[PDB]
Amino acid sequence: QSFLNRVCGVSAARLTPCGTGTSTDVVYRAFDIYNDKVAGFAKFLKTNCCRFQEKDEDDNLIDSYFVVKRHTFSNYQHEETIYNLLKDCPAVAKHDFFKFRIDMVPHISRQRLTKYTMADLVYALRHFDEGNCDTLKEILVTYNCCDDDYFNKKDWYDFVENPDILRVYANLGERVRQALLKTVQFCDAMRNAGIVGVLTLDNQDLNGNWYDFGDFIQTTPGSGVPVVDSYYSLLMPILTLTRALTAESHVDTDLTKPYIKWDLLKYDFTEERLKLFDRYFKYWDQTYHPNCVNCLDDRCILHCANFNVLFSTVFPPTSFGPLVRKIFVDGVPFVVSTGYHFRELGVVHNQDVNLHSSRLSFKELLVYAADPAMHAASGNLLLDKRTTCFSVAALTNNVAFQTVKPGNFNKDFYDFAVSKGFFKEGSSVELKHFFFAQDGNAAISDYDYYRYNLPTMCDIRQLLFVVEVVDKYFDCYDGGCINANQVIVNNLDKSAGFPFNKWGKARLYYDSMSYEDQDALFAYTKRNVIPTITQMNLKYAISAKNRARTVAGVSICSTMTNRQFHQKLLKSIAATRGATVVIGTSKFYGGWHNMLKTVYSDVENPHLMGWDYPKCDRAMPNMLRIMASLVLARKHTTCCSLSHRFYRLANECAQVLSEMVMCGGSLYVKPGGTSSGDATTAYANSVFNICQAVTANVNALLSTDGNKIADKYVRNLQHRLYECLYRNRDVDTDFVNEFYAYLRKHFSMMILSDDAVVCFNSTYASQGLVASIKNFKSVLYYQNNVFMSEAKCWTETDLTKGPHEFCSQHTMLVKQGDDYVYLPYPDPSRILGAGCFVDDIVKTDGTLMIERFVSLAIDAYPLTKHPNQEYADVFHLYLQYIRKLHDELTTSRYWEPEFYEAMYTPHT
């Protein structure tokens, strides 16, 4: 107790021992660490300090802690000198150096710290696991974000089933903003005193005070260099999750004051972004361009768009979108868009604007009709209280309420199927796939699911490494620009989007334009931004859940140029076998077997894993979509310049990422996500899927205790992984090759859009060296803003059983001829529901369209190799009904099972 009153000091604080006696306490905390013996951002165990909790006058415990560090004596003298240089900075926690008789040993007492550091909050949110979140609950209850009985609500953490958790995390926001301002003050003190050193998150309180001067080196004053790369980069997802800059939208930066009233005509905000970057990120040493048209490469675009998404949360939502001018064509006033203000890319101005023209060609008619400026400026004002999304205009005087009708019942096949014995009580095969009808409020209710899209900042150094590893997965393909006579449009009798669907299908605009007009329009989009309108339609399809599906038809002005930009690379992806992205690979003629044998390739202790993306089209962040389009456009290094590649990226973001959306005769603003009818949507979803998997492996490897890794090679790989992320700003292509080889050896992926099957090493994942399901849950929590429950994931120990689900198909290993192959089979209720319920009354004929049942029996063939007899009777039911229709109509092979056994054997 005589040690306690020396620790109490002159501060007159009532102290209770958090440990026992005079011994050193043991805590378990998260440290960001980089030695020549360990690296990583991991949870370690700290046996360095004695803690003393502070009591109040009514002896309830306070969040003040006295943390007394025992160490060597040279560190004591060194930290005393550094502290005496920095004692008048108000961002420094107050220190008290003394020596005591524990035998004399020196002690460094840090006064009135919090219980947790900033590293503990950042680890709590970036390695989230429900059922193992005690630091996050203690931080939320301590700083009055919520009460303790908030967590008794089940799914309190889920962003989708409980969107009130954003209000709770946003009560940590001013705490994080004060922490940022104290870091800028401490960096200014280090630069004035001449002190060099790395700022680490575990040396900073939640109050914002800094300590642990034991690695700081003195130089001449005025010339201090603070290293803040790992600090800000590991902090960056918390800045948007807790909404730290919301106080910047108030008057004099005070949450008690009102909101700043901006000018409505103001769009620029470049000086305000530069001031925000100077205030919060002053010592971040990479140059920042507020408008990304001034960027130097694609990594600069990613780096600067990541600051723009944070700073665009401060600005009014009416300032973003198409920037609009008045233009006199044929002496006639006119309204066009001459630019765009992107939340991510800043202000883009069109280069080829014509302030005066006498006539309009067919190309500029197409560009002016696709423009939302003339439709929005001619419409009424709209205030839609049904949805939270931003509403622009009502194009007409009515609100359209489109419904979905139910399915049409094919009664002949149903009583033929109950004639054979199907659909009994307690049977294994039932009906679960129906055409669910919808009412007039279904399109806006499905448009309201864009509220899961939140403005999300990324760990930019982690992302800039992951983009090189993900670009390694696309090195085999060949891409580049093609001419308009090399494009291949498959279905020309499809919709052309709004407003072009008033006058024709896509056949009309592909026939009415020349190849030279199409090439001129494509050359126009490499210099100017054309915003377009995406139309939302309700899908009339068969499903198991009553959720209404919407499709997003993109206008022909966007699709025509995006085919010309991307089609070479997309045809190269879809024509490659044996690769990770298996778009284009058929499941027939032994294709499923070859895909599974490619994914199993040479993994050592193999397990299968497959996960889920909850709300993947809606909740995908804008930075990952921009990242995916940059990865796709990395094939255009010879045909396209840098400025042309930027204008193509800006056209993708103004056309399918944050476009204006017509939904029932009314324009709304899309927050982000993927448009379903984009030209490149499956391939961009494949890029996003591989990105999240690579991020999960990076987060698994870096959060592992490097003392416990028994392989020397994996331990040095973890060291260099930390160095390539945070301690190095060039691309280290040798380590990208090495990490990509490590991933191909231990984490083998089969990716088709959102769907994926990995074959992973089990001993490496149990040691935490490749990712597992918990890593994916964490990465989707802080990057994707969704909680992926483990009920929608699957793992698999036996590889003689296939994947559990891939592309709605299950896998069976069956003896075909003299081999054992992997056959895919669907859910038998899906095939029976496609038989029983249709969408057209002429598909109820049966005697017309035998072809329909022939295709369904092709899909339901491998059910005959199943152990369940009721599963195997589905193919024989389809055979007998095909035979019945084919006989009472009036080629006998359609009820011979050899035509269908031919579809699953390798002889194509």
Binding site: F401, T403, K405, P406, G407, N408, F409, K411, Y414, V418, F423, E425, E430, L431, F434, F435, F436, A437, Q438, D439, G440, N441, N546, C836, F837
Partner: protein, 69 residues
């Protein structure tokens, strides 16, 4: 049994659709709610209660004649 009540709710909502229930929003909402809840049922008593409530919409308007069929 339950397959029969699901299939006849599909036919019943299709005939309520072609009888222009969709011209009344407040009626078509309840009809699709009953139809979607019949198609999702797990025990047949719930399905038959909702089936009775959905058939009452058909019989409640004079556009049908129950004598002829």
């Amino acid at each position: 049994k339950m397959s029969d009540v699901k299939c006849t709710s599909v036919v019943l909502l299709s005939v309520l659709q072609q009888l222009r229930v969709e011209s009344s929003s407040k009626l078509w909402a309840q009809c699709v709610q009953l139809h979607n809840d019949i198609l999702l049922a797990k025990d047949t008593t719930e399905a038959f209660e909702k089936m009775v409530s959905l058939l009452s919409v058909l019989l409640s308007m004079q556009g049908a004649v129950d004598i002829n069929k």
